[PDB]
């Protein structure tokens, strides 16, 4: 069996709840689904619902009850959702649906998207101090999955990730950034699955690869936790011992793989960490050469930025860790994927549902050591009909890279769906995420966005 929740986590939980229970209540974000076989019929339903919502009877009915009723309707070809906090938002929203006009809190589409979603598991550079905390405190399903990863990581590494999440005083490091994002990635995916969602395919990026292997059915939750724990601690301990001449930095710079081929001939020890976008690459190596490429970008008008690490993931530097990584991962049982995988480790190539297991000890070693072919994997997805990309992350930084690839590939209207972001209400964010998934017609039981009704007052007399 597994360690329980630590007494300290409980202590921090009690105090967090104390704090939460004392903030001014913010009105919840409610999704309003409006659906029909034809778009014209959808637009008239929209207009009807709006009219009724303007009437005293409609004005007396809670947004939540309107939503629950709307959610129980039959959901057809042409869909819309209005995301609202209050009646006025709601009406303004529904008018736009009716008028075929655009709005930030509105999504409206003529029919389903024809291919399933790609779940993007990245993480690199997305951490922030409070990530996952608010959703942990407010969502029992999410909480449950966090606590399961917390239990398994306590077992693996001897500390509590949940403590970090709950404690505003702690920030994240090389090691704890990785396992905590991972917990959050696992819990988000399973929250989503709880509401009916499923990935058609996954794509990993750097530290996200362990989560993607779990959601692809490539490894058990325990074995995926091993992969992330083995690597993050080795990496943190290695990077902590680095000073002066051994230090290797990481930076994002606005050069393509092709520009980098030429540019690198001035910088013999630079390596490519992540091909992020067609025009963006994360490079790594000696500070003086990293500093030099940065200043050459600056002088050419190109963007660049350093990552906070004394160590360069995805290079030859990582060679001393591989011995121990190998040994720590003995026993992991790679399994046949239950969904498609764009493997950024394996150069962006696609592995089929039912295919051969890829997630063996050497995959983890290859992934840590070598370049991450993210953009190539994304292009491969797009070229095969995928248009929905949903990022499971505390902050949707990879999705922005995804966007650059889709556009470059000519897909100017992809479905780019974030989850959590810093400075956005986390409960709201997930409602929004599941509403988007509904609209585009991917798997998602919208009824589950509402608690089972306790009485007639939990429904609304919306027009037929």
């Amino acid at each position: 069996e597994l360690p329980g929740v630590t007494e300290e986590a409980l202590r921090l939980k009690e105090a967090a709840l104390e704090e939460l229970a004392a903030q001014e209540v913010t009105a919840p974000l409610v999704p309003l689904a409006v659906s029909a076989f034809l778009t014209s019929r959808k637009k008239a339903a929209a207009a009807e619902l709006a009219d009724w919502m303007q009437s005293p009877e409609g004005q007396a009915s809670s947004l939540e009850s309107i939503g629950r009723s709307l959610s129980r309707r039959n959901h057809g070809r042409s869909r819309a959702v209005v995301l609202a906090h209050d009646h006025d938002e709601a009406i303004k929203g529904l008018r736009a649906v009716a008028a075929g006009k655009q709005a930030p809190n509105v999504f409206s589409v003529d029919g389903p998207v024809t291919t399933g979603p790609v779940w993007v598991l990245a993480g690199f550079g997305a951490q922030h101090r409070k990530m996952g905390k608010s959703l942990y405190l407010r969502n029992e399903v999410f909480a449950a999955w966090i606590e399961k990863v917390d239990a398994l990581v306590q077992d693996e590494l001897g500390y509590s990730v949940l403590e970090l999440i709950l404690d505003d005083a702690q920030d994240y490091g090389i090691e704890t950034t990785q396992v905590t994002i991972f917990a959050i990635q696992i819990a988000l995916g399973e929250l989503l699955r709880h509401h009916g969602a499923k990935p058609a395919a996954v794509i990993g990026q750097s530290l996200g690869e362990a989560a993607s292997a779990y959601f692809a059915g490539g490894l058990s939750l325990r074995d995926a936790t091993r992969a992330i724990c083995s690597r993050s601690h080795l990496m943190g301990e290695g990077e902590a011992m680095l000073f002066g001449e051994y230090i290797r930095l990481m930076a994002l710079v606005e050069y393509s793989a092709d520009e980098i081929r030429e540019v690198f001939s001035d910088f013999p020890d630079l390596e490519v960490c992540v091909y992020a976008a067609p025009t963006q690459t994360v490079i790594g190596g000696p500070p003086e050469q990293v500093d030099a490429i940065l200043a050459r970008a600056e002088a050419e008008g190109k963007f660049a930025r350093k990552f906070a690490t004394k160590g360069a993931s995805h290079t030859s530097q990582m060679d001393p860790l591989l011995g121990e990584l190998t040994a720590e991962l003995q026993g992991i049982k790679p399994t046949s994927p239950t969904c498609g995988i764009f493997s950024t480790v394996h150069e962006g190539r696609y592995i089929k549902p039912g295919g051969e297991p890829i997630h063996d000890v050497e995959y983890w070693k290859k992934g840590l050591r070598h370049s991450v072919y993210f953009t190539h994997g994304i292009r491969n997805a797009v070229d095969s009909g995928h248009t929905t990309f949903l990022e499971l992350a505390p902050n949707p930084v990879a999705l922005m890279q995804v966007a650059l690839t889709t556009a470059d590939a000519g897909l100017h209207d992809a479905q780019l769906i974030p989850t959590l972001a810093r400075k956005q209400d986390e409960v709201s964010s997930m409602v929004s995420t599941m509403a988007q998934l509904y609209v585009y017609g991917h798997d998602l039981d919208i009824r589950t966005l509402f608690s089972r009704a306790s009485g007639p007052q939990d429904y609304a007399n919306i027009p037929p």
Binding site: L83, P104, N105, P396, L399, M400, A403, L416, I417, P418, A421, Q424, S428, S429, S432, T433, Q436
Partner: peptide, 10 residues
């Protein structure tokens, strides 16, 4: 890119 209060890459 500014991903806004509703999950939209603006």
């Amino acid at each position: 890119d500014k991903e806004n209060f509703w999950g939209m890459a603006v």
